[PDB]
Amino acid sequence: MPHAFKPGDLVFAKMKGYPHWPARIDDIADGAVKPPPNKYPIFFFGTHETAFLGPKDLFPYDKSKDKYGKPNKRKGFNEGLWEIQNNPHASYS
């Protein structure tokens, strides 16, 4: 059975006006800005941007890849697909 989300978990993350996007749950570095209550820091592959999102917008990668893991016109997406498949736990800084 599933646990709560934890840093390192791979997902497709959904933001208004964007397709479901390859992403991971990040750690918060010592000394860094924490997310609001009930939100997780999401690192979007490809764009390398972070946003704060709640579970309703987080779709586990394994279950969802057949549906959402298809190439897309949007900037950074295809790069994103490569990252989540090939090196999802790398430093992208």
Side-chain angles (χ1 to χ4, degrees), residues 24-50:
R24 66 182 186 205
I25 312 277
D26 260 0
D27 289 286
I28 305 144
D30 280 341
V33 176
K34 296 180 278 182
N38 294 283
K39 303 319 179 57
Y40 289 80
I42 308 302
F43 179 81
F44 287 87
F45 292 119
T47 54
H48 312 146
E49 303 174 357
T50 292

mmCIF file with all atom_site columns, all heavy atoms in Angstrom, residues 24-50:
data_model
loop_
_atom_site.group_PDB
_atom_site.id
_atom_site.type_symbol
_atom_site.label_atom_id
_atom_site.label_alt_id
_atom_site.label_comp_id
_atom_site.label_asym_id
_atom_site.label_entity_id
_atom_site.label_seq_id
_atom_site.pdbx_PDB_ins_code
_atom_site.Cartn_x
_atom_site.Cartn_y
_atom_site.Cartn_z
_atom_site.occupancy
_atom_site.B_iso_or_equiv
_atom_site.pdbx_formal_charge
_atom_site.auth_seq_id
_atom_site.auth_comp_id
_atom_site.auth_asym_id
_atom_site.auth_atom_id
_atom_site.pdbx_PDB_model_num
ATOM 1   N N   . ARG A 1 24 ? 9.957  15.703 -9.574  1.00 0.00 ? 24 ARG A N   1
ATOM 2   C CA  . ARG A 1 24 ? 10.256 14.903 -8.404  1.00 0.00 ? 24 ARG A CA  1
ATOM 3   C C   . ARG A 1 24 ? 9.929  15.721 -7.160  1.00 0.00 ? 24 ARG A C   1
ATOM 4   O O   . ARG A 1 24 ? 9.850  16.948 -7.238  1.00 0.00 ? 24 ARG A O   1
ATOM 5   C CB  . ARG A 1 24 ? 11.717 14.471 -8.400  1.00 0.00 ? 24 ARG A CB  1
ATOM 6   C CG  . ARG A 1 24 ? 12.667 15.653 -8.249  1.00 0.00 ? 24 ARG A CG  1
ATOM 7   C CD  . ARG A 1 24 ? 14.155 15.179 -8.290  1.00 0.00 ? 24 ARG A CD  1
ATOM 8   N NE  . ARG A 1 24 ? 15.099 16.279 -8.002  1.00 0.00 ? 24 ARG A NE  1
ATOM 9   C CZ  . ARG A 1 24 ? 16.361 16.312 -8.407  1.00 0.00 ? 24 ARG A CZ  1
ATOM 10  N NH1 . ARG A 1 24 ? 16.851 15.351 -9.182  1.00 0.00 ? 24 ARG A NH1 1
ATOM 11  N NH2 . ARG A 1 24 ? 17.124 17.334 -8.072  1.00 0.00 ? 24 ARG A NH2 1
ATOM 12  N N   . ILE A 1 25 ? 9.757  15.030 -6.025  1.00 0.00 ? 25 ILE A N   1
ATOM 13  C CA  . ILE A 1 25 ? 9.650  15.705 -4.738  1.00 0.00 ? 25 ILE A CA  1
ATOM 14  C C   . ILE A 1 25 ? 11.075 15.992 -4.300  1.00 0.00 ? 25 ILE A C   1
ATOM 15  O O   . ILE A 1 25 ? 11.876 15.062 -4.307  1.00 0.00 ? 25 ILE A O   1
ATOM 16  C CB  . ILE A 1 25 ? 8.964  14.802 -3.699  1.00 0.00 ? 25 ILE A CB  1
ATOM 17  C CG1 . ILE A 1 25 ? 7.674  14.171 -4.262  1.00 0.00 ? 25 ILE A CG1 1
ATOM 18  C CG2 . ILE A 1 25 ? 8.723  15.579 -2.383  1.00 0.00 ? 25 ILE A CG2 1
ATOM 19  C CD1 . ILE A 1 25 ? 6.462  15.073 -4.190  1.00 0.00 ? 25 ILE A CD1 1
ATOM 20  N N   . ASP A 1 26 ? 11.380 17.266 -4.020  1.00 0.00 ? 26 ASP A N   1
ATOM 21  C CA  . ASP A 1 26 ? 12.724 17.632 -3.587  1.00 0.00 ? 26 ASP A CA  1
ATOM 22  C C   . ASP A 1 26 ? 12.859 17.589 -2.069  1.00 0.00 ? 26 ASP A C   1
ATOM 23  O O   . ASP A 1 26 ? 11.883 17.565 -1.322  1.00 0.00 ? 26 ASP A O   1
ATOM 24  C CB  . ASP A 1 26 ? 13.143 19.017 -4.043  1.00 0.00 ? 26 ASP A CB  1
ATOM 25  C CG  . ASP A 1 26 ? 14.036 19.057 -5.267  1.00 0.00 ? 26 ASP A CG  1
ATOM 26  O OD1 . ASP A 1 26 ? 14.375 17.968 -5.813  1.00 0.00 ? 26 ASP A OD1 1
ATOM 27  O OD2 . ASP A 1 26 ? 14.358 20.167 -5.678  1.00 0.00 ? 26 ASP A OD2 1
ATOM 28  N N   . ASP A 1 27 ? 14.120 17.534 -1.635  1.00 0.00 ? 27 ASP A N   1
ATOM 29  C CA  . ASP A 1 27 ? 14.486 17.875 -0.275  1.00 0.00 ? 27 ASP A CA  1
ATOM 30  C C   . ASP A 1 27 ? 14.435 19.398 -0.112  1.00 0.00 ? 27 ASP A C   1
ATOM 31  O O   . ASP A 1 27 ? 14.456 20.144 -1.088  1.00 0.00 ? 27 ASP A O   1
ATOM 32  C CB  . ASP A 1 27 ? 15.898 17.391 0.008   1.00 0.00 ? 27 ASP A CB  1
ATOM 33  C CG  . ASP A 1 27 ? 16.070 15.882 0.134   1.00 0.00 ? 27 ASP A CG  1
ATOM 34  O OD1 . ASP A 1 27 ? 15.651 15.326 1.173   1.00 0.00 ? 27 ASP A OD1 1
ATOM 35  O OD2 . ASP A 1 27 ? 16.627 15.277 -0.809  1.00 0.00 ? 27 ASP A OD2 1
ATOM 36  N N   . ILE A 1 28 ? 14.371 19.858 1.133   1.00 0.00 ? 28 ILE A N   1
ATOM 37  C CA  . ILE A 1 28 ? 14.627 21.260 1.433   1.00 0.00 ? 28 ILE A CA  1
ATOM 38  C C   . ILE A 1 28 ? 16.031 21.301 2.030   1.00 0.00 ? 28 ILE A C   1
ATOM 39  O O   . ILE A 1 28 ? 16.278 20.582 3.002   1.00 0.00 ? 28 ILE A O   1
ATOM 40  C CB  . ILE A 1 28 ? 13.589 21.748 2.454   1.00 0.00 ? 28 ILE A CB  1
ATOM 41  C CG1 . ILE A 1 28 ? 12.157 21.485 1.955   1.00 0.00 ? 28 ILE A CG1 1
ATOM 42  C CG2 . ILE A 1 28 ? 13.834 23.221 2.811   1.00 0.00 ? 28 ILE A CG2 1
ATOM 43  C CD1 . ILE A 1 28 ? 11.174 21.101 3.048   1.00 0.00 ? 28 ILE A CD1 1
ATOM 44  N N   . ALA A 1 29 ? 16.947 22.072 1.422   1.00 0.00 ? 29 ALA A N   1
ATOM 45  C CA  . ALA A 1 29 ? 18.313 22.169 1.936   1.00 0.00 ? 29 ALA A CA  1
ATOM 46  C C   . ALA A 1 29 ? 18.301 22.939 3.259   1.00 0.00 ? 29 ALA A C   1
ATOM 47  O O   . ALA A 1 29 ? 17.449 23.797 3.504   1.00 0.00 ? 29 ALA A O   1
ATOM 48  C CB  . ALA A 1 29 ? 19.256 22.815 0.940   1.00 0.00 ? 29 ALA A CB  1
ATOM 49  N N   . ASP A 1 30 ? 19.205 22.546 4.153   1.00 0.00 ? 30 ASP A N   1
ATOM 50  C CA  . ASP A 1 30 ? 19.469 23.335 5.343   1.00 0.00 ? 30 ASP A CA  1
ATOM 51  C C   . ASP A 1 30 ? 19.585 24.792 4.939   1.00 0.00 ? 30 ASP A C   1
ATOM 52  O O   . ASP A 1 30 ? 20.331 25.139 4.022   1.00 0.00 ? 30 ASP A O   1
ATOM 53  C CB  . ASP A 1 30 ? 20.735 22.880 6.056   1.00 0.00 ? 30 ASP A CB  1
ATOM 54  C CG  . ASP A 1 30 ? 20.544 21.641 6.916   1.00 0.00 ? 30 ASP A CG  1
ATOM 55  O OD1 . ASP A 1 30 ? 19.390 21.322 7.254   1.00 0.00 ? 30 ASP A OD1 1
ATOM 56  O OD2 . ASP A 1 30 ? 21.548 21.007 7.249   1.00 0.00 ? 30 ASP A OD2 1
ATOM 57  N N   . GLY A 1 31 ? 18.822 25.619 5.653   1.00 0.00 ? 31 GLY A N   1
ATOM 58  C CA  . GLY A 1 31 ? 18.897 27.059 5.525   1.00 0.00 ? 31 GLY A CA  1
ATOM 59  C C   . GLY A 1 31 ? 18.014 27.616 4.412   1.00 0.00 ? 31 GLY A C   1
ATOM 60  O O   . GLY A 1 31 ? 17.920 28.831 4.291   1.00 0.00 ? 31 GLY A O   1
ATOM 61  N N   . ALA A 1 32 ? 17.375 26.729 3.625   1.00 0.00 ? 32 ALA A N   1
ATOM 62  C CA  . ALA A 1 32 ? 16.572 27.129 2.474   1.00 0.00 ? 32 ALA A CA  1
ATOM 63  C C   . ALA A 1 32 ? 15.116 27.372 2.890   1.00 0.00 ? 32 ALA A C   1
ATOM 64  O O   . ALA A 1 32 ? 14.650 26.839 3.892   1.00 0.00 ? 32 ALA A O   1
ATOM 65  C CB  . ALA A 1 32 ? 16.626 26.029 1.419   1.00 0.00 ? 32 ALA A CB  1
ATOM 66  N N   . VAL A 1 33 ? 14.403 28.146 2.061   1.00 0.00 ? 33 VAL A N   1
ATOM 67  C CA  . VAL A 1 33 ? 12.980 28.451 2.188   1.00 0.00 ? 33 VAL A CA  1
ATOM 68  C C   . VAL A 1 33 ? 12.160 27.165 2.135   1.00 0.00 ? 33 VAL A C   1
ATOM 69  O O   . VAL A 1 33 ? 12.322 26.361 1.217   1.00 0.00 ? 33 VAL A O   1
ATOM 70  C CB  . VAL A 1 33 ? 12.613 29.376 1.008   1.00 0.00 ? 33 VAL A CB  1
ATOM 71  C CG1 . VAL A 1 33 ? 11.117 29.673 0.976   1.00 0.00 ? 33 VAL A CG1 1
ATOM 72  C CG2 . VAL A 1 33 ? 13.434 30.664 1.037   1.00 0.00 ? 33 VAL A CG2 1
ATOM 73  N N   . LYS A 1 34 ? 11.306 26.992 3.151   1.00 0.00 ? 34 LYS A N   1
ATOM 74  C CA  . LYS A 1 34 ? 10.432 25.841 3.318   1.00 0.00 ? 34 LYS A CA  1
ATOM 75  C C   . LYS A 1 34 ? 9.137  26.104 2.551   1.00 0.00 ? 34 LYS A C   1
ATOM 76  O O   . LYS A 1 34 ? 8.810  27.257 2.298   1.00 0.00 ? 34 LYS A O   1
ATOM 77  C CB  . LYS A 1 34 ? 10.070 25.583 4.787   1.00 0.00 ? 34 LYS A CB  1
ATOM 78  C CG  . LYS A 1 34 ? 11.217 25.199 5.742   1.00 0.00 ? 34 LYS A CG  1
ATOM 79  C CD  . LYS A 1 34 ? 10.795 24.951 7.190   1.00 0.00 ? 34 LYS A CD  1
ATOM 80  C CE  . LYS A 1 34 ? 10.639 26.182 8.045   1.00 0.00 ? 34 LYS A CE  1
ATOM 81  N NZ  . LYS A 1 34 ? 10.287 25.782 9.410   1.00 0.00 ? 34 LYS A NZ  1
ATOM 82  N N   . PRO A 1 35 ? 8.351  25.059 2.192   1.00 0.00 ? 35 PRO A N   1
ATOM 83  C CA  . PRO A 1 35 ? 7.115  25.249 1.431   1.00 0.00 ? 35 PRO A CA  1
ATOM 84  C C   . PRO A 1 35 ? 6.063  25.606 2.473   1.00 0.00 ? 35 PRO A C   1
ATOM 85  O O   . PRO A 1 35 ? 6.254  25.348 3.651   1.00 0.00 ? 35 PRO A O   1
ATOM 86  C CB  . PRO A 1 35 ? 6.828  23.855 0.830   1.00 0.00 ? 35 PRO A CB  1
ATOM 87  C CG  . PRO A 1 35 ? 8.018  22.991 1.226   1.00 0.00 ? 35 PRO A CG  1
ATOM 88  C CD  . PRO A 1 35 ? 8.590  23.639 2.490   1.00 0.00 ? 35 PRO A CD  1
ATOM 89  N N   . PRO A 1 36 ? 4.900  26.161 2.074   1.00 0.00 ? 36 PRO A N   1
ATOM 90  C CA  . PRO A 1 36 ? 3.772  26.306 2.997   1.00 0.00 ? 36 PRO A CA  1
ATOM 91  C C   . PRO A 1 36 ? 3.397  24.955 3.588   1.00 0.00 ? 36 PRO A C   1
ATOM 92  O O   . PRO A 1 36 ? 3.778  23.914 3.039   1.00 0.00 ? 36 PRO A O   1
ATOM 93  C CB  . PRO A 1 36 ? 2.626  26.839 2.123   1.00 0.00 ? 36 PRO A CB  1
ATOM 94  C CG  . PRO A 1 36 ? 3.318  27.427 0.920   1.00 0.00 ? 36 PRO A CG  1
ATOM 95  C CD  . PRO A 1 36 ? 4.625  26.674 0.726   1.00 0.00 ? 36 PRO A CD  1
ATOM 96  N N   . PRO A 1 37 ? 2.635  24.954 4.713   1.00 0.00 ? 37 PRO A N   1
ATOM 97  C CA  . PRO A 1 37 ? 1.924  23.766 5.199   1.00 0.00 ? 37 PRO A CA  1
ATOM 98  C C   . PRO A 1 37 ? 1.179  22.983 4.122   1.00 0.00 ? 37 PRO A C   1
ATOM 99  O O   . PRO A 1 37 ? 0.528  23.562 3.263   1.00 0.00 ? 37 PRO A O   1
ATOM 100 C CB  . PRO A 1 37 ? 0.940  24.304 6.281   1.00 0.00 ? 37 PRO A CB  1
ATOM 101 C CG  . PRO A 1 37 ? 1.128  25.803 6.290   1.00 0.00 ? 37 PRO A CG  1
ATOM 102 C CD  . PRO A 1 37 ? 2.436  26.122 5.594   1.00 0.00 ? 37 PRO A CD  1
ATOM 103 N N   . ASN A 1 38 ? 1.325  21.659 4.156   1.00 0.00 ? 38 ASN A N   1
ATOM 104 C CA  . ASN A 1 38 ? 0.588  20.753 3.288   1.00 0.00 ? 38 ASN A CA  1
ATOM 105 C C   . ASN A 1 38 ? 1.056  20.803 1.830   1.00 0.00 ? 38 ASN A C   1
ATOM 106 O O   . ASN A 1 38 ? 0.466  20.107 1.004   1.00 0.00 ? 38 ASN A O   1
ATOM 107 C CB  . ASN A 1 38 ? -0.918 20.904 3.467   1.00 0.00 ? 38 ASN A CB  1
ATOM 108 C CG  . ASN A 1 38 ? -1.338 20.459 4.847   1.00 0.00 ? 38 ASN A CG  1
ATOM 109 O OD1 . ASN A 1 38 ? -1.426 19.255 5.124   1.00 0.00 ? 38 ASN A OD1 1
ATOM 110 N ND2 . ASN A 1 38 ? -1.565 21.416 5.728   1.00 0.00 ? 38 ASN A ND2 1
ATOM 111 N N   . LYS A 1 39 ? 2.103  21.598 1.522   1.00 0.00 ? 39 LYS A N   1
ATOM 112 C CA  . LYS A 1 39 ? 2.687  21.647 0.183   1.00 0.00 ? 39 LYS A CA  1
ATOM 113 C C   . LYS A 1 39 ? 4.065  20.963 0.158   1.00 0.00 ? 39 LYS A C   1
ATOM 114 O O   . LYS A 1 39 ? 4.749  20.841 1.186   1.00 0.00 ? 39 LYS A O   1
ATOM 115 C CB  . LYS A 1 39 ? 2.705  23.077 -0.368  1.00 0.00 ? 39 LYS A CB  1
ATOM 116 C CG  . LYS A 1 39 ? 1.347  23.827 -0.463  1.00 0.00 ? 39 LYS A CG  1
ATOM 117 C CD  . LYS A 1 39 ? 0.193  22.958 -0.945  1.00 0.00 ? 39 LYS A CD  1
ATOM 118 C CE  . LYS A 1 39 ? -1.194 23.563 -1.066  1.00 0.00 ? 39 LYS A CE  1
ATOM 119 N NZ  . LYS A 1 39 ? -1.213 24.739 -1.941  1.00 0.00 ? 39 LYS A NZ  1
ATOM 120 N N   . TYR A 1 40 ? 4.463  20.497 -1.028  1.00 0.00 ? 40 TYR A N   1
ATOM 121 C CA  . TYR A 1 40 ? 5.750  19.822 -1.207  1.00 0.00 ? 40 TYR A CA  1
ATOM 122 C C   . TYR A 1 40 ? 6.573  20.637 -2.189  1.00 0.00 ? 40 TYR A C   1
ATOM 123 O O   . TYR A 1 40 ? 6.016  21.217 -3.107  1.00 0.00 ? 40 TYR A O   1
ATOM 124 C CB  . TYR A 1 40 ? 5.531  18.434 -1.835  1.00 0.00 ? 40 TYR A CB  1
ATOM 125 C CG  . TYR A 1 40 ? 4.887  17.431 -0.882  1.00 0.00 ? 40 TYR A CG  1
ATOM 126 C CD1 . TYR A 1 40 ? 3.514  17.425 -0.653  1.00 0.00 ? 40 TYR A CD1 1
ATOM 127 C CD2 . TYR A 1 40 ? 5.655  16.544 -0.146  1.00 0.00 ? 40 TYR A CD2 1
ATOM 128 C CE1 . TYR A 1 40 ? 2.935  16.541 0.250   1.00 0.00 ? 40 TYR A CE1 1
ATOM 129 C CE2 . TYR A 1 40 ? 5.094  15.646 0.750   1.00 0.00 ? 40 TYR A CE2 1
ATOM 130 C CZ  . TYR A 1 40 ? 3.727  15.643 0.942   1.00 0.00 ? 40 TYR A CZ  1
ATOM 131 O OH  . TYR A 1 40 ? 3.192  14.776 1.854   1.00 0.00 ? 40 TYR A OH  1
ATOM 132 N N   . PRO A 1 41 ? 7.924  20.657 -2.108  1.00 0.00 ? 41 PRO A N   1
ATOM 133 C CA  . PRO A 1 41 ? 8.693  21.371 -3.113  1.00 0.00 ? 41 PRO A CA  1
ATOM 134 C C   . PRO A 1 41 ? 8.819  20.468 -4.334  1.00 0.00 ? 41 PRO A C   1
ATOM 135 O O   . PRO A 1 41 ? 9.337  19.358 -4.252  1.00 0.00 ? 41 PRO A O   1
ATOM 136 C CB  . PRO A 1 41 ? 10.054 21.639 -2.446  1.00 0.00 ? 41 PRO A CB  1
ATOM 137 C CG  . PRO A 1 41 ? 10.131 20.683 -1.305  1.00 0.00 ? 41 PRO A CG  1
ATOM 138 C CD  . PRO A 1 41 ? 8.743  20.039 -1.053  1.00 0.00 ? 41 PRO A CD  1
ATOM 139 N N   . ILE A 1 42 ? 8.317  20.935 -5.465  1.00 0.00 ? 42 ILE A N   1
ATOM 140 C CA  . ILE A 1 42 ? 8.352  20.096 -6.646  1.00 0.00 ? 42 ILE A CA  1
ATOM 141 C C   . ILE A 1 42 ? 9.429  20.643 -7.573  1.00 0.00 ? 42 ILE A C   1
ATOM 142 O O   . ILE A 1 42 ? 9.394  21.797 -7.985  1.00 0.00 ? 42 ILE A O   1
ATOM 143 C CB  . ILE A 1 42 ? 6.977  20.029 -7.348  1.00 0.00 ? 42 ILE A CB  1
ATOM 144 C CG1 . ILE A 1 42 ? 5.880  19.639 -6.377  1.00 0.00 ? 42 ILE A CG1 1
ATOM 145 C CG2 . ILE A 1 42 ? 7.023  19.082 -8.561  1.00 0.00 ? 42 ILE A CG2 1
ATOM 146 C CD1 . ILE A 1 42 ? 6.084  18.295 -5.673  1.00 0.00 ? 42 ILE A CD1 1
ATOM 147 N N   . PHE A 1 43 ? 10.325 19.752 -7.987  1.00 0.00 ? 43 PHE A N   1
ATOM 148 C CA  . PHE A 1 43 ? 11.298 20.111 -8.995  1.00 0.00 ? 43 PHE A CA  1
ATOM 149 C C   . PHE A 1 43 ? 10.825 19.582 -10.344 1.00 0.00 ? 43 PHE A C   1
ATOM 150 O O   . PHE A 1 43 ? 10.655 18.376 -10.515 1.00 0.00 ? 43 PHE A O   1
ATOM 151 C CB  . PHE A 1 43 ? 12.650 19.515 -8.569  1.00 0.00 ? 43 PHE A CB  1
ATOM 152 C CG  . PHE A 1 43 ? 13.738 19.829 -9.583  1.00 0.00 ? 43 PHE A CG  1
ATOM 153 C CD1 . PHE A 1 43 ? 14.381 21.078 -9.567  1.00 0.00 ? 43 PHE A CD1 1
ATOM 154 C CD2 . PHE A 1 43 ? 14.121 18.880 -10.539 1.00 0.00 ? 43 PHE A CD2 1
ATOM 155 C CE1 . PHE A 1 43 ? 15.388 21.362 -10.481 1.00 0.00 ? 43 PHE A CE1 1
ATOM 156 C CE2 . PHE A 1 43 ? 15.124 19.181 -11.471 1.00 0.00 ? 43 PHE A CE2 1
ATOM 157 C CZ  . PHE A 1 43 ? 15.753 20.415 -11.432 1.00 0.00 ? 43 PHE A CZ  1
ATOM 158 N N   . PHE A 1 44 ? 10.626 20.489 -11.315 1.00 0.00 ? 44 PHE A N   1
ATOM 159 C CA  . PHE A 1 44 ? 10.167 20.081 -12.638 1.00 0.00 ? 44 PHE A CA  1
ATOM 160 C C   . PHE A 1 44 ? 11.416 19.796 -13.471 1.00 0.00 ? 44 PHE A C   1
ATOM 161 O O   . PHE A 1 44 ? 12.292 20.675 -13.615 1.00 0.00 ? 44 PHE A O   1
ATOM 162 C CB  . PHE A 1 44 ? 9.384  21.261 -13.265 1.00 0.00 ? 44 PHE A CB  1
ATOM 163 C CG  . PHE A 1 44 ? 8.024  21.434 -12.589 1.00 0.00 ? 44 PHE A CG  1
ATOM 164 C CD1 . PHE A 1 44 ? 7.887  22.215 -11.431 1.00 0.00 ? 44 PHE A CD1 1
ATOM 165 C CD2 . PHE A 1 44 ? 6.886  20.813 -13.097 1.00 0.00 ? 44 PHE A CD2 1
ATOM 166 C CE1 . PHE A 1 44 ? 6.653  22.343 -10.786 1.00 0.00 ? 44 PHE A CE1 1
ATOM 167 C CE2 . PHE A 1 44 ? 5.658  20.924 -12.429 1.00 0.00 ? 44 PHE A CE2 1
ATOM 168 C CZ  . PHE A 1 44 ? 5.542  21.706 -11.298 1.00 0.00 ? 44 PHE A CZ  1
ATOM 169 N N   . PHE A 1 45 ? 11.474 18.586 -14.029 1.00 0.00 ? 45 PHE A N   1
ATOM 170 C CA  . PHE A 1 45 ? 12.569 18.204 -14.923 1.00 0.00 ? 45 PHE A CA  1
ATOM 171 C C   . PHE A 1 45 ? 12.430 19.033 -16.202 1.00 0.00 ? 45 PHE A C   1
ATOM 172 O O   . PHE A 1 45 ? 11.326 19.480 -16.553 1.00 0.00 ? 45 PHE A O   1
ATOM 173 C CB  . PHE A 1 45 ? 12.496 16.694 -15.211 1.00 0.00 ? 45 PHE A CB  1
ATOM 174 C CG  . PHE A 1 45 ? 12.800 15.794 -14.012 1.00 0.00 ? 45 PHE A CG  1
ATOM 175 C CD1 . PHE A 1 45 ? 11.857 14.908 -13.508 1.00 0.00 ? 45 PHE A CD1 1
ATOM 176 C CD2 . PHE A 1 45 ? 14.077 15.764 -13.448 1.00 0.00 ? 45 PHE A CD2 1
ATOM 177 C CE1 . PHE A 1 45 ? 12.142 14.085 -12.414 1.00 0.00 ? 45 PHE A CE1 1
ATOM 178 C CE2 . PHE A 1 45 ? 14.356 14.937 -12.364 1.00 0.00 ? 45 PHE A CE2 1
ATOM 179 C CZ  . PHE A 1 45 ? 13.408 14.066 -11.865 1.00 0.00 ? 45 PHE A CZ  1
ATOM 180 N N   . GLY A 1 46 ? 13.555 19.244 -16.887 1.00 0.00 ? 46 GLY A N   1
ATOM 181 C CA  . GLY A 1 46 ? 13.528 19.965 -18.147 1.00 0.00 ? 46 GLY A CA  1
ATOM 182 C C   . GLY A 1 46 ? 13.626 21.463 -17.910 1.00 0.00 ? 46 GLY A C   1
ATOM 183 O O   . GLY A 1 46 ? 14.631 22.058 -18.277 1.00 0.00 ? 46 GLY A O   1
ATOM 184 N N   . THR A 1 47 ? 12.633 22.050 -17.219 1.00 0.00 ? 47 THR A N   1
ATOM 185 C CA  . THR A 1 47 ? 12.634 23.480 -16.941 1.00 0.00 ? 47 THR A CA  1
ATOM 186 C C   . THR A 1 47 ? 13.552 23.758 -15.767 1.00 0.00 ? 47 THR A C   1
ATOM 187 O O   . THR A 1 47 ? 14.121 24.840 -15.644 1.00 0.00 ? 47 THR A O   1
ATOM 188 C CB  . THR A 1 47 ? 11.233 24.005 -16.627 1.00 0.00 ? 47 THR A CB  1
ATOM 189 O OG1 . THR A 1 47 ? 10.787 23.166 -15.572 1.00 0.00 ? 47 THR A OG1 1
ATOM 190 C CG2 . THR A 1 47 ? 10.270 23.972 -17.792 1.00 0.00 ? 47 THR A CG2 1
ATOM 191 N N   . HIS A 1 48 ? 13.649 22.772 -14.879 1.00 0.00 ? 48 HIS A N   1
ATOM 192 C CA  . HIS A 1 48 ? 14.433 22.903 -13.666 1.00 0.00 ? 48 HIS A CA  1
ATOM 193 C C   . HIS A 1 48 ? 13.845 23.956 -12.732 1.00 0.00 ? 48 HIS A C   1
ATOM 194 O O   . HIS A 1 48 ? 14.573 24.475 -11.883 1.00 0.00 ? 48 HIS A O   1
ATOM 195 C CB  . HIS A 1 48 ? 15.925 23.129 -13.959 1.00 0.00 ? 48 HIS A CB  1
ATOM 196 C CG  . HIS A 1 48 ? 16.455 22.169 -14.961 1.00 0.00 ? 48 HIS A CG  1
ATOM 197 N ND1 . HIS A 1 48 ? 17.433 22.542 -15.847 1.00 0.00 ? 48 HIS A ND1 1
ATOM 198 C CD2 . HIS A 1 48 ? 16.190 20.866 -15.207 1.00 0.00 ? 48 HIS A CD2 1
ATOM 199 C CE1 . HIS A 1 48 ? 17.739 21.502 -16.621 1.00 0.00 ? 48 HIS A CE1 1
ATOM 200 N NE2 . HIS A 1 48 ? 16.993 20.475 -16.251 1.00 0.00 ? 48 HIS A NE2 1
ATOM 201 N N   . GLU A 1 49 ? 12.556 24.274 -12.883 1.00 0.00 ? 49 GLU A N   1
ATOM 202 C CA  . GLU A 1 49 ? 11.876 25.199 -11.978 1.00 0.00 ? 49 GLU A CA  1
ATOM 203 C C   . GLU A 1 49 ? 11.278 24.430 -10.797 1.00 0.00 ? 49 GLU A C   1
ATOM 204 O O   . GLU A 1 49 ? 11.040 23.227 -10.921 1.00 0.00 ? 49 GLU A O   1
ATOM 205 C CB  . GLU A 1 49 ? 10.717 25.884 -12.697 1.00 0.00 ? 49 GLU A CB  1
ATOM 206 C CG  . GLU A 1 49 ? 11.165 26.627 -13.949 1.00 0.00 ? 49 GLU A CG  1
ATOM 207 C CD  . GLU A 1 49 ? 10.043 27.205 -14.786 1.00 0.00 ? 49 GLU A CD  1
ATOM 208 O OE1 . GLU A 1 49 ? 8.838  27.019 -14.472 1.00 0.00 ? 49 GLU A OE1 1
ATOM 209 O OE2 . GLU A 1 49 ? 10.416 27.860 -15.784 1.00 0.00 ? 49 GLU A OE2 1
ATOM 210 N N   . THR A 1 50 ? 11.081 25.128 -9.661  1.00 0.00 ? 50 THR A N   1
ATOM 211 C CA  . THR A 1 50 ? 10.430 24.593 -8.472  1.00 0.00 ? 50 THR A CA  1
ATOM 212 C C   . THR A 1 50 ? 9.079  25.293 -8.293  1.00 0.00 ? 50 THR A C   1
ATOM 213 O O   . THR A 1 50 ? 8.943  26.480 -8.569  1.00 0.00 ? 50 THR A O   1
ATOM 214 C CB  . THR A 1 50 ? 11.336 24.784 -7.249  1.00 0.00 ? 50 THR A CB  1
ATOM 215 O OG1 . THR A 1 50 ? 12.491 23.951 -7.354  1.00 0.00 ? 50 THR A OG1 1
ATOM 216 C CG2 . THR A 1 50 ? 10.650 24.446 -5.935  1.00 0.00 ? 50 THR A CG2 1
#
